[PDB]
Design an enzyme around this catalytic site. Structure first.
Site, PDB file in Angstrom:
ATOM      1  N   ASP A 218      -1.363  -3.022  14.731  1.00  0.00           N
ATOM      2  CA  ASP A 218      -1.786  -2.895  13.253  1.00  0.00           C
ATOM      3  C   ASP A 218      -3.173  -3.512  13.164  1.00  0.00           C
ATOM      4  OD1 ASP A 218      -2.342  -3.619  10.411  1.00  0.00           O
ATOM      5  OD2 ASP A 218      -0.237  -3.122  10.289  1.00  0.00           O
ATOM      6  N   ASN A 219      -3.375  -4.908  13.227  1.00  0.00           N
ATOM      7  CA  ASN A 219      -4.508  -5.841  12.945  1.00  0.00           C
ATOM      8  C   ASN A 219      -5.724  -5.322  13.556  1.00  0.00           C
ATOM      9  OD1 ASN A 219      -1.975  -6.966  11.831  1.00  0.00           O
ATOM     10  ND2 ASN A 219      -2.837  -8.677  11.674  1.00  0.00           N
TER      11      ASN A 219
ATOM     12  N   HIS B 249      -4.409   2.601   8.169  1.00  0.00           N
ATOM     13  CA  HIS B 249      -4.034   2.888   9.611  1.00  0.00           C
ATOM     14  C   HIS B 249      -3.499   4.117   9.782  1.00  0.00           C
ATOM     15  CE1 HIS B 249      -5.713  -1.195   9.661  1.00  0.00           C
ATOM     16  NE2 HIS B 249      -4.541  -1.680  10.064  1.00  0.00           N
TER      17      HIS B 249
ATOM     18  N   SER C 233       2.337  -0.824  -5.201  1.00  0.00           N
ATOM     19  CA  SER C 233       1.492  -0.943  -4.060  1.00  0.00           C
ATOM     20  C   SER C 233       0.849  -2.122  -4.230  1.00  0.00           C
ATOM     21  CB  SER C 233       0.007  -0.048  -4.509  1.00  0.00           C
ATOM     22  OG  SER C 233      -0.755  -0.201  -3.280  1.00  0.00           O
TER      23      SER C 233
ATOM     24  N   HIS D 182      -7.714  -9.135   3.396  1.00  0.00           N
ATOM     25  CA  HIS D 182      -6.683  -8.750   2.450  1.00  0.00           C
ATOM     26  C   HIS D 182      -7.195  -8.671   1.042  1.00  0.00           C
ATOM     27  CE1 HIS D 182      -2.789  -7.833   0.680  1.00  0.00           C
ATOM     28  NE2 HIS D 182      -2.944  -8.657   0.009  1.00  0.00           N
TER      29      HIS D 182
ATOM     30  N   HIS E  58       0.730  -1.057   0.020  1.00  0.00           N
ATOM     31  CA  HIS E  58      -0.182  -0.038   0.118  1.00  0.00           C
ATOM     32  C   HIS E  58       0.789   1.412  -0.149  1.00  0.00           C
ATOM     33  CE1 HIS E  58      -3.034  -2.941   0.870  1.00  0.00           C
ATOM     34  NE2 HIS E  58      -2.231  -3.333   2.142  1.00  0.00           N
TER      35      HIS E  58
ATOM     36  N   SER F 105      -5.460   1.280  -2.670  1.00  0.00           N
ATOM     37  CA  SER F 105      -4.886   1.785  -1.438  1.00  0.00           C
ATOM     38  C   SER F 105      -3.882   2.748  -1.479  1.00  0.00           C
ATOM     39  CB  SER F 105      -4.066   0.466  -0.641  1.00  0.00           C
ATOM     40  OG  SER F 105      -3.225  -0.078  -1.536  1.00  0.00           O
TER      41      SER F 105
ATOM     42  N   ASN G 165       4.122 -10.138  10.740  1.00  0.00           N
ATOM     43  CA  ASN G 165       2.744  -9.983  11.096  1.00  0.00           C
ATOM     44  C   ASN G 165       2.770 -10.317  12.617  1.00  0.00           C
ATOM     45  OD1 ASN G 165      -0.417  -9.743  10.452  1.00  0.00           O
ATOM     46  ND2 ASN G 165      -0.028 -11.564  11.595  1.00  0.00           N
TER      47      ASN G 165
ATOM     48  N   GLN H 260       9.380  -4.038   9.925  1.00  0.00           N
ATOM     49  CA  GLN H 260       9.818  -4.373   8.884  1.00  0.00           C
ATOM     50  C   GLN H 260      11.228  -4.072   8.718  1.00  0.00           C
ATOM     51  OE1 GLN H 260       9.075  -5.748   6.163  1.00  0.00           O
ATOM     52  NE2 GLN H 260       6.807  -6.080   6.010  1.00  0.00           N
TER      53      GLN H 260
ATOM     54  N   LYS I 234       2.830  -5.633  16.093  1.00  0.00           N
ATOM     55  CA  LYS I 234       2.430  -5.520  14.509  1.00  0.00           C
ATOM     56  C   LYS I 234       0.819  -6.241  14.698  1.00  0.00           C
ATOM     57  CE  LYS I 234       0.981  -6.003  10.335  1.00  0.00           C
ATOM     58  NZ  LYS I 234      -0.179  -6.779   9.627  1.00  0.00           N
TER      59      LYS I 234
ATOM     60  N   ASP J 212       3.408  -7.558   1.188  1.00  0.00           N
ATOM     61  CA  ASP J 212       2.157  -7.461   2.044  1.00  0.00           C
ATOM     62  C   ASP J 212       1.146  -8.248   1.231  1.00  0.00           C
ATOM     63  OD1 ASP J 212      -0.146  -6.760   3.251  1.00  0.00           O
ATOM     64  OD2 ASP J 212       0.453  -4.616   3.834  1.00  0.00           O
TER      65      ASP J 212
ATOM     66  N   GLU K 287       4.256  -8.864   5.526  1.00  0.00           N
ATOM     67  CA  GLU K 287       3.428  -7.936   6.463  1.00  0.00           C
ATOM     68  C   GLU K 287       2.175  -8.291   7.123  1.00  0.00           C
ATOM     69  OE1 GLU K 287       4.461  -4.818   7.326  1.00  0.00           O
ATOM     70  OE2 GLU K 287       2.504  -3.949   7.916  1.00  0.00           O
TER      71      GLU K 287
ATOM     72  N   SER L  87       4.173  -1.799  13.004  1.00  0.00           N
ATOM     73  CA  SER L  87       4.286  -2.570  11.869  1.00  0.00           C
ATOM     74  C   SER L  87       5.750  -2.173  11.270  1.00  0.00           C
ATOM     75  CB  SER L  87       3.350  -2.577  10.945  1.00  0.00           C
ATOM     76  OG  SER L  87       2.112  -2.585  11.678  1.00  0.00           O
TER      77      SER L  87
ATOM     78  N   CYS M  44      -7.947  -1.177  12.591  1.00  0.00           N
ATOM     79  CA  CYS M  44      -8.988  -1.331  12.123  1.00  0.00           C
ATOM     80  C   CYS M  44     -10.038  -0.879  13.039  1.00  0.00           C
ATOM     81  CB  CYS M  44      -9.263  -2.803  11.826  1.00  0.00           C
ATOM     82  SG  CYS M  44      -8.269  -3.658  10.388  1.00  0.00           S
TER      83      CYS M  44
HETATM   84  N1  LIG Z   1      -7.348  -3.881   6.129  1.00  0.00           N
HETATM   85  C1  LIG Z   1      -6.248  -4.015   7.057  1.00  0.00           C
HETATM   86  O1  LIG Z   1      -5.854  -2.991   7.449  1.00  0.00           O
HETATM   87  C2  LIG Z   1      -5.757  -5.320   7.352  1.00  0.00           C
HETATM   88  C3  LIG Z   1      -4.884  -5.339   8.523  1.00  0.00           C
HETATM   89  C4  LIG Z   1      -4.359  -6.638   8.934  1.00  0.00           C
HETATM   90  C5  LIG Z   1      -4.878  -7.866   8.349  1.00  0.00           C
HETATM   91  N2  LIG Z   1      -5.506  -7.680   7.113  1.00  0.00           N
HETATM   92  C6  LIG Z   1      -5.948  -9.015   6.618  1.00  0.00           C
HETATM   93  O2  LIG Z   1      -7.255  -9.297   7.453  1.00  0.00           O
HETATM   94  C7  LIG Z   1      -7.441 -10.532   7.521  1.00  0.00           C
HETATM   95  C8  LIG Z   1      -7.851 -11.268   8.520  1.00  0.00           C
HETATM   96  O3  LIG Z   1      -6.493 -11.053   9.436  1.00  0.00           O
HETATM   97  P1  LIG Z   1      -6.517 -11.481  11.175  1.00  0.00           P
HETATM   98  O4  LIG Z   1      -5.011 -10.999  11.318  1.00  0.00           O
HETATM   99  O5  LIG Z   1      -7.498 -10.951  11.758  1.00  0.00           O
HETATM  100  O6  LIG Z   1      -6.387 -12.901  10.849  1.00  0.00           O
HETATM  101  P2  LIG Z   1      -7.167 -14.262  11.932  1.00  0.00           P
HETATM  102  O7  LIG Z   1      -6.712 -15.392  11.644  1.00  0.00           O
HETATM  103  O8  LIG Z   1      -6.294 -13.367  13.343  1.00  0.00           O
HETATM  104  O9  LIG Z   1      -8.429 -13.929  12.200  1.00  0.00           O
HETATM  105  C9  LIG Z   1      -9.439 -14.184  11.010  1.00  0.00           C
HETATM  106  C10 LIG Z   1     -10.639 -15.052  11.431  1.00  0.00           C
HETATM  107  O10 LIG Z   1     -11.592 -15.353  10.546  1.00  0.00           O
HETATM  108  C11 LIG Z   1     -12.322 -16.510  11.063  1.00  0.00           C
HETATM  109  N3  LIG Z   1     -13.125 -17.149  10.140  1.00  0.00           N
HETATM  110  C12 LIG Z   1     -12.457 -17.716   9.040  1.00  0.00           C
HETATM  111  N4  LIG Z   1     -13.274 -18.094   8.227  1.00  0.00           N
HETATM  112  C13 LIG Z   1     -14.436 -17.934   8.746  1.00  0.00           C
HETATM  113  C14 LIG Z   1     -15.812 -18.170   8.318  1.00  0.00           C
HETATM  114  N5  LIG Z   1     -16.393 -18.704   7.241  1.00  0.00           N
HETATM  115  N6  LIG Z   1     -16.721 -17.481   8.924  1.00  0.00           N
HETATM  116  C15 LIG Z   1     -16.593 -16.757  10.160  1.00  0.00           C
HETATM  117  N7  LIG Z   1     -15.227 -16.424  10.676  1.00  0.00           N
HETATM  118  C16 LIG Z   1     -14.242 -17.198   9.907  1.00  0.00           C
HETATM  119  C17 LIG Z   1     -11.155 -17.345  11.815  1.00  0.00           C
HETATM  120  O11 LIG Z   1     -11.878 -18.263  12.742  1.00  0.00           O
HETATM  121  C18 LIG Z   1     -10.378 -16.126  12.247  1.00  0.00           C
HETATM  122  O12 LIG Z   1     -10.451 -16.211  13.908  1.00  0.00           O
HETATM  123  C19 LIG Z   1      -6.484 -11.324   6.499  1.00  0.00           C
HETATM  124  O13 LIG Z   1      -6.572 -11.183   5.177  1.00  0.00           O
HETATM  125  C20 LIG Z   1      -5.455 -10.275   6.737  1.00  0.00           C
HETATM  126  O14 LIG Z   1      -4.265 -10.223   5.744  1.00  0.00           O
HETATM  127  C21 LIG Z   1      -6.162  -6.447   6.818  1.00  0.00           C
HETATM  128  N1  LIG Z   2      -1.735   3.097   6.137  1.00  0.00           N
HETATM  129  C1  LIG Z   2      -1.260   1.897   5.885  1.00  0.00           C
HETATM  130  N2  LIG Z   2      -0.065   2.021   4.841  1.00  0.00           N
HETATM  131  C2  LIG Z   2       0.475   0.919   4.664  1.00  0.00           C
HETATM  132  N3  LIG Z   2       0.003  -0.483   4.965  1.00  0.00           N
HETATM  133  C3  LIG Z   2      -1.231  -0.300   5.625  1.00  0.00           C
HETATM  134  N4  LIG Z   2      -1.916  -1.453   6.189  1.00  0.00           N
HETATM  135  C4  LIG Z   2      -3.236  -0.815   6.787  1.00  0.00           C
HETATM  136  N5  LIG Z   2      -2.767   0.245   6.682  1.00  0.00           N
HETATM  137  C5  LIG Z   2      -1.823   0.682   5.954  1.00  0.00           C
HETATM  138  K   LIG Z   3      -3.318   6.757   7.253  1.00  0.00           K
END
Ligand SMILES: NC(=O)c1ccc[n+]([C@@H]2O[C@H](COP(=O)([O-])OP(=O)(O)OC[C@H]3O[C@@H](n4cnc5c(N)ncnc54)[C@H](O)[C@@H]3O)[C@@H](O)[C@H]2O)c1
Ligand SMILES: Nc1ncnc2[nH]cnc12
Ligand SMILES: [K+]
Ligand SMILES: NC(=O)c1ccc[n+]([C@@H]2O[C@H](COP(=O)([O-])OP(=O)(O)OC[C@H]3O[C@@H](n4cnc5c(N)ncnc54)[C@H](O)[C@@H]3O)[C@@H](O)[C@H]2O)c1
Ligand SMILES: NC(=O)c1ccc[n+]([C@@H]2O[C@H](COP(=O)([O-])OP(=O)(O)OC[C@H]3O[C@@H](n4cnc5c(N)ncnc54)[C@H](O)[C@@H]3O)[C@@H](O)[C@H]2O)c1
Ligand SMILES: CN(Cc1cnn(C)c1)C(=O)C1CCCCC1
Ligand SMILES: CN(Cc1cnn(C)c1)C(=O)C1CCCCC1
Ligand SMILES: Nc1ncnc2[nH]cnc12
Ligand SMILES: Nc1ncnc2[nH]cnc12
Ligand SMILES: [K+]
Ligand SMILES: [K+]
Lengths: 461, 461, 461
Positions: free
Chosen positions: B190-191, B374, B76, B315, B53, B81, B181, B386, B186, B131, B156, B382, B195
């Site tokens: 982050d996660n 974020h 990216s 993701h 991103h 993103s 991760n 890295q 992280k 990532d 990541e 995070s 969010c």
């Molecule tokens: N958008 C963001 O900023 C961001 C940040 C970090 C991670 N992510 C992504 O988000 C996703 C989840 O990351 P995470 O760290 O929380 O993983 P995680 O393993 O900690 O949690 C995912 C959860 O989904 C549940 N799950 C799976 N299949 C399911 C279903 N069918 N119904 C209901 N629940 C179900 C699992 O039991 C698990 O607890 C990954 O793709 C990760 O890369 C996005």
């Molecule tokens: N602001 C950001 N920059 C890079 N990676 C990210 N993942 C989630 N938020 C982000």
């Molecule tokens: K930001």
């Protein structure tokens, strides 16, 4: 061949119409009024001068007045609060509107005058809808003859209602008004919950700062300060609250906030020595919510932590001494409505200076300046009240009374509780909520009618 | 005469640079790494392919790697993103970057290949920062010869680590990798907290919908699902949580959420009859958080309450069956990354149809697609991991090891707890927090060094 | 003619039985094991020495072990934590128990010995269930011969596990152990959520003090500290957190707490000069959660705000320097487990002195001392783990293995994740939650079995 308008970019109209259609689904009280009264046309013959933030929400209000028979001429009541796509949609629908995001002060006054004047002559207006009292003031000050034909004013906000009560006590108010602000479905919905939604929204859009774990000082704990404090606390900020009203201070304590003053022992004598420099030195974010003057003053700004954010969500920018900052400190625009203010001097700045404050919306209403204000489903309550108030004053035809009769009906009033409740019911249904109905014996037991009103007029909710 | 880049608008660089300078003051752990390692130049001679991103926060990461001696070529890892002013700032700094907001799928793949190829030949890269695993996959699948010169990969995100672990299990991973991760600074920052900050932020920017009092369904309750549910609950939504992991479901119960399944008995047999139509017909907002496939499926989409918002913060976009929606339903663009999906059919739509869903970011990560992801102070954690991960793998020089040492070193590992704690301490100081030092008797009492680490590797925090 | 017990009042048995019957309906995981295994009688022949707070919840634990075929002899692991009606109901059922609320230190030791001794000589015990390690210590130091026939120890709490690990490291542990604490359905349930429920409960019962608007300092932010901080924050306290672990401190910052130290710059040099007297003079309530020694020391106690409440929710009372307060300050009992400690001197006190602290449970575990500890529905998780841990170690029959096999099984281990998940599933179902079932393709996609386990052993939840 419609040309009676002035907006930023007319080609944003289609985008604005898409968002108006969505917003209509988010405003059931207002759209219920539109359906209920459309065939009766209770505003046929009304000519409404409107001055309120030219947002998507205001667009739904405008088209509701027009749907009920009114003609309008519209301006925004703030230089930064317009959403250009909303103004564009309203102009494209053939409605005179003069409004764009980022007006100058001179352009702000010109826009109001364009609503007042049609083809260089006073419009035959007969109704006023205001937010903050600027349009009301201009009419009384510069166009008093127009008020001879105006049946009333419906005022949106606390500051505007204050200005109205001042004119009433001084005998300078020329037409009756309805205080829309003090409906419960306005004050305890818009002023509080609206700022809860939109304050952290504006701060994130302007700065993208993490708020969790950081220190905030909210000046004021009325309805706006209550909602603002919640907006920050729910994000995990450590929130301190200042107040001059002990009852509001008590509520802040009981709500879980530490109550502090920017001044030692609360005593503001105007000197640097009165500032609690230790307290202000730890504040990451200060928000003014009072509707008062100079509640974040020059000595507070000097003492604030480096890189603190400073913003105002009260109606007027004089809550913060931005004049002091224009006179003494150098401004660096980060992006529109976001300025770094370098406390190192007035003439120039080092681009890597660490001693700056971040000011949002140049100290104007931050929720509308840096985001989009309150969401449609909240403004639904406020704007249903506005439509009801417009109908009441227009149907009473105050301007057509003899001189003796005008003197007896000159007042500032609120809408009856029965209407307040009916607005609230429509809002609850919009959430899917189900209100319980009293049994006849339950209604007799507490001494109310089954259909309400359910509380005496003294009830505070 | 620098021309090795492609961005939306190079004139956004000054604006990007202003925001980078602000972000540096928000990222003390990353900025602290610049100072401690600048003199030593631990990445001198490193040539890093980076795919993540292209935000302001990634800008600070990029310029930290360069300040420590690295050359980089950046893209990216998502089509929506990128922050265009961040990409402009980086390119204007003479750094090769191929990223803009709103890429097509073909342009996405093209951008990654522009990092891999310099002047039409493979770049002499020796490090990878990824990532999601897309760059890693393309290298293994299409440029395996380049992996002969690459010392390691620092990944990541959870989805990317899973892909690394599958490759490792299959014997199809050619260089060692660091799982960034699973550092606590992280994953549990982050996660989760990222969010919490950015989900409601993105929904507000996309729709400006009031969230208070409405019904949400969060699919998943891992780290992202925990932070997402809090993002919505703190706004006053009534949040329901679905999960396949009973431990995570227990946590949701104890956190005060009702745990439900979209399917009768929790059995997803793929039929419309299995959908709890009553539940889905009450949901105003569905958010997928799982990293899994088709958890907001076609039958659920058919049963959602009219005008519900649908988004994904996992993701990849296949968490929602958007393909089904492309095939069957008409898409109306409200504005970029906001579409109304009309369930009346595929051949056009009525502009005033009430039977639609609102999809954000076309089902791509919503926080980065409809907002800015974020905040800097969270990404500090995070990206400090890295940089530390890149230093450790680059100085290990895997590509120069004998084949016997290579086989012993081919693994997927996390950073040691001491480094995790050291990142955390700089984050805590950025908040003004003060950590207490153990006395020698206290350290002996609990069996830890005064300098830490303070927990066994099994500790879950 | 059963007399092999000692309790406060046997006539409380009927009351205790009523509450056990209610608690059974609140403990579905525990009762599910009871129904599942009662036919198999997997504890037939087990002879369990048990030492854990003699609460209603432990009553359901005890009768489950008996229902599965075991004989037990029972004592409490704290002088203040027994519920006398629970002990009476257990004794009335013909089960050896030696426990009452308000034991002296001598009586506490005597009670453990009465479980160890039958008819004045060591019982033929072959299993141990412990909470905190006191029984485990007495066996190893005073009855080491008994451990040659004991198949294992199932240890409840963090402090107890610490002592087991020290013994294993020193080679003094004589029998294998199961770390029950570090099941997620124990640590991230009991330690966190249990204290969230019972900490403010115990403070209200002891003092009936309003907590909203007042200042609290929580020493520690592990599982107990996280739950304790939430216990107070949800009541509206202004909560500050102290920590030595920068990772836990980071979490407290992100959770919305200000992280402070009782010592200037966090350095405890043993002098009053190092105490942040300004911070501590603002604190209305201090809570220790560390399992460490003297984290609320004499100099802190001297600097606390007058009338502050002091209490400990860690396992042992040495977290607070109560010995200092016994030697120097006059103690005034308000009621059982509530003392005012007058800092005006040792020899008597003025009844109307304003300079005192309020100590709860004499610094012993405050949730069990001044209230009833964790609720049945939370202890369900912990005690279902205990039962499974007892079955596993008993069936392994460690004591009868060849020593060459013993050496391979002499460890401290946790239960498998699959059983952790099964306990969690029954708790979720107790709430009416519905866990969703992965489809075969979804399970394939994330690399798990449809039946679980759903996370790698490194997952932190
Ligand atoms: N958008 C963001 O900023 C961001 C940040 C970090 C991670 N992510 C992504 O988000 C996703 C989840 O990351 P995470 O760290 O929380 O993983 P995680 O393993 O900690 O949690 C995912 C959860 O989904 C549940 N799950 C799976 N299949 C399911 C279903 N069918 N119904 C209901 N629940 C179900 C699992 O039991 C698990 O607890 C990954 O793709 C990760 O890369 C996005
Ligand atoms: N602001 C950001 N920059 C890079 N990676 C990210 N993942 C989630 N938020 C982000
Ligand atoms: K930001
Ligand atoms: N931005 C928005 O969307 C929005 C919405 C509604 C109202 N407003 C405006 O916000 C302002 C406040 O509205 P309100 O309904 O909360 O009014 P209010 O009377 O309920 O609250 C203002 C509070 O400020 C306190 N106060 C006054 N002077 C102070 C000082 N020096 N220091 C600290 N506290 C002080 C008062 O005691 C009072 O409680 C008005 O200008 C109103 O027009 C803005
Ligand atoms: N009363 C109850 O119901 C109950 C329940 C579970 C556990 N416990 C007990 O509570 C204690 C803590 O258990 P836990 O599971 O939270 O352990 P934990 O390891 O998760 O947390 C203890 C925390 O205290 C911190 N700490 C240590 N010394 C410190 C100091 N001087 N100042 C500040 N912070 C310091 C550590 O860094 C750690 O994070 C143990 O004694 C445990 O047996 C009590
Ligand atoms: C690596 N160092 C030196 C150090 C600290 N502790 N120890 C034992 C060594 C740092 O300070 C970094 C830590 C992470 C990011 C900011 C600065
Ligand atoms: C219901 N399920 C799970 C499943 C499989 N596919 N999907 C979409 C769900 C089964 O596997 C049954 C199917 C028939 C008989 C044996 C087992
Ligand atoms: N969205 C909005 N439109 C009009 N007036 C407002 N006042 C606050 N929010 C508003
Ligand atoms: N109610 C309870 N019973 C037994 N042990 C406990 N530990 C914490 N709460 C408890
Ligand atoms: K809005
Ligand atoms: K209890």
């Amino acid at each position: 061949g419609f040309t009676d308008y002035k907006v930023a970019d007319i080609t944003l109209a289609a985008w604005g119409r898409r968002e108006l259609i969505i917003a209509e689904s988010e405003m059931p009280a207002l759209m219920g009024l539109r359906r209920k009264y459309a065939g009766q046309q209770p505003l046929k013959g009304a000519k409404i001068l409107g001055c309120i933030h030219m947002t998507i929400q205001t667009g739904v209000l405008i088209e509701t007045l027009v749907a009920l028979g009114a003609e309008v001429r519209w301006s925004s009541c703030n230089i930064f609060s317009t959403q250009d796509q909303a103004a564009a949609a309203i102009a494209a629908a053939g409605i005179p509107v003069f409004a764009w995001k980022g007006e100058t002060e001179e352009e702000y006054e010109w826009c109001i005058e364009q609503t007042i004047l049609k083809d260089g002559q006073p419009w035959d207006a007969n109704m006023v809808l205001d937010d903050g009292g600027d349009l009301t003031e201009i009419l009384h000050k510069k166009y008093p003859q127009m008020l001879e034909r105006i049946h009333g004013i419906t005022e949106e906000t606390t500051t505007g209602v204050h200005r109205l009560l001042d004119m009433l006590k001084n005998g300078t108010l020329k037409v009756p008004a309805i205080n829309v602000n003090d409906s419960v479905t306005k004050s305890k919905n818009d002023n509080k919950y609206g700022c809860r939604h939109s304050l952290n929204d504006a701060i994130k859009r302007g700065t993208d700062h993490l708020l969790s774990g950081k220190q905030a000082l909210v000046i004021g704990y009325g309805d706006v300060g209550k909602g603002s404090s919640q907006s920050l606390r729910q994000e995990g900020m450590i929130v301190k609250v200042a107040e001059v009203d002990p009852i509001c201070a008590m509520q802040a304590c009981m709500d879980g906030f530490e109550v502090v003053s920017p001044y030692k022992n609360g005593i503001n004598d105007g000197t640097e020595a009165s500032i609690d420099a230790a307290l202000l030195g730890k504040i990451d974010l200060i928000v003014t919510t009072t509707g008062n003057v100079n509640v974040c003053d020059a000595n507070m700004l000097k003492a604030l932590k480096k890189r603190a954010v400073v913003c105002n969500i009260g109606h007027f920018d004089n809550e913060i001494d931005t004049a002091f900052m224009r006179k003494n400190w150098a401004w660096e625009e980060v992006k529109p409505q976001v300025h770094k203010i370098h406390r190192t001097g007035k003439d120039g700045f080092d681009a890597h200076n660490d001693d700056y404050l971040i000011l949002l919306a140049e100290g104007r209403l931050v929720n509308l300046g840096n985001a989009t204000g309150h969401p449609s489903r909240i403004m639904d309550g406020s704007f249903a009240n506005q439509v009801l108030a417009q109908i009441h004053l227009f149907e009473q035809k105050y301007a057509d009374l003899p001189a003796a009769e005008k003197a007896k009906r000159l007042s500032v009033e609120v809408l009856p509780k029965k209407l307040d409740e009916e607005v609230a019911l429509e809002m609850v249904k919009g959430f899917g909520g189900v209100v319980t109905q009293l049994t006849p014996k339950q209604a007799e037991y507490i001494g109310v009618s089954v259909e309400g009103p359910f509380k005496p007029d003294t009830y505070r909710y």
